[PDB]
Design a protein around this ligand. Sequence first.
Ligand SMILES: Cc1[nH]c2ccc(-c3ccccc3)cc2c1CCN
Ligand SMILES: Cc1[nH]c2ccc(-c3ccccc3)cc2c1CCN
Ligand SMILES: [Ca+2]
Ligand SMILES: [Ca+2]
Ligand SMILES: [Ca+2]
Ligand SMILES: [Ca+2]
Lengths: 214, 214
Amino acid sequence: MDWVVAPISVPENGKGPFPQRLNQLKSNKDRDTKIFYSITGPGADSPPEGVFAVEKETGWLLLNKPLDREEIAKYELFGHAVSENGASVEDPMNISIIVTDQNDHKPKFTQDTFRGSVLEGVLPGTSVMQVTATDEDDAIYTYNGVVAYSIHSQEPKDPHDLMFTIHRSTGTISVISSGLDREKVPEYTLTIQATDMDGDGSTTTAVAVVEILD
Amino acid sequence: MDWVVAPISVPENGKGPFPQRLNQLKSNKDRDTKIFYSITGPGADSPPEGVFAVEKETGWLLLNKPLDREEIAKYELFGHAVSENGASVEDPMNISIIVTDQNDHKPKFTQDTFRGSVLEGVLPGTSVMQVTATDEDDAIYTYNGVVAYSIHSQEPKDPHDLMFTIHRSTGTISVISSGLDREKVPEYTLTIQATDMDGDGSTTTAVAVVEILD
Ligand SMILES: Cc1[nH]c2ccc(-c3ccccc3)cc2c1CCN
Ligand SMILES: Cc1[nH]c2ccc(-c3ccccc3)cc2c1CCN
Ligand SMILES: [Ca+2]
Ligand SMILES: [Ca+2]
Ligand SMILES: [Ca+2]
Ligand SMILES: [Ca+2]
């Protein structure tokens, strides 16, 4: 009884010293001759070379350097078993290395300044613009690339203080208080923020400048 | 050819929807009857009950909740092959789950205010005190719980702007400049900071109060 496929899930940007052992190969029939192991493939004997390596005698698969999942996210290697007489004993076994995500990219805003506009008498609830930011990290399986949006401050304060909201996850700045007037205040400037791990991580700052129109 | 041991490495505090498929069991006795798969061990039928489960007619090993490594960092379970007559077929296979760590804990100083002191006439380089922050994440195999120390600000900014420094990894504050004097400034108040992922992570802040002596 065994696994149908056995991938090796390896957290990226890892520490300690290298090499590191990952799993150990063994062939069914190694009381026949002595067995010498070898790995091949992209990440072993093709570029990037020398990222993975196997111990000839012991069969330990080794990690040589830390992996950036944000560069290569999975490898496909092959295990080779060759007796001391030169005989390929088994078929090269599929070795699959899945690189899992650490939170090693701060979220970075689309543009340094975002510019949008709206009109004096729009009903509370009304879209005005959408900002964004990208986090190069993963957002399907981890929260490391999932972004939360917020508004820090609003200048000028004038008719109110919470003049706008931004949707936490889509980045849509709405107006929420009727009371706009282009003559009294023509150009608000929102100081906005993107925060990875869904608000519990790093925070990048940028600005959105809403102009109110006649 | 196979691994002598295939643990499953599962990033903690995972996203997406659950359950989640991890690997699939299979018995090299299934070209016979229709086998039915079950699962035992702490995390399965012991406390905490129900974190893993396997689809009886597929063998897929499912994860029901997101894991917290700092709550439990490893699981040893057993999978079971039975036919329609509850008949144990081969022995139970061992399932080893290795919860890999994410940066889900901000660094916490041990006290809000460290108190130290040093004589006015000590030489530049002279140690003074050593502050400390602890991060619950792994600092062995990952940077998530590796702290980096820094002085935010010193007040009063008398005589020089920066009279002290701190070891980035050890927490030891030392004197970097000449000119302490109890008569002129008898105490300095150092805003200290601790940042995880060895600097590129989350921060909290404390203060170290250094008294100058005759
Ligand atoms: C619980 C968990 N964490 C993962 C992290 C990464 C990949 C993964 C699989 C194939 C290619 C690339 C990545 C799969 C998983 C799963 C199983 C959920 N289908
Ligand atoms: C994040 C991470 N990566 C690993 C890689 C390997 C082993 C490991 C498990 C059993 C024996 C020897 C080593 C443990 C870990 C952890 C959890 C850190 N408490
Ligand atoms: Ca790499
Ligand atoms: Ca748990
Ligand atoms: Ca941490
Ligand atoms: Ca953690």
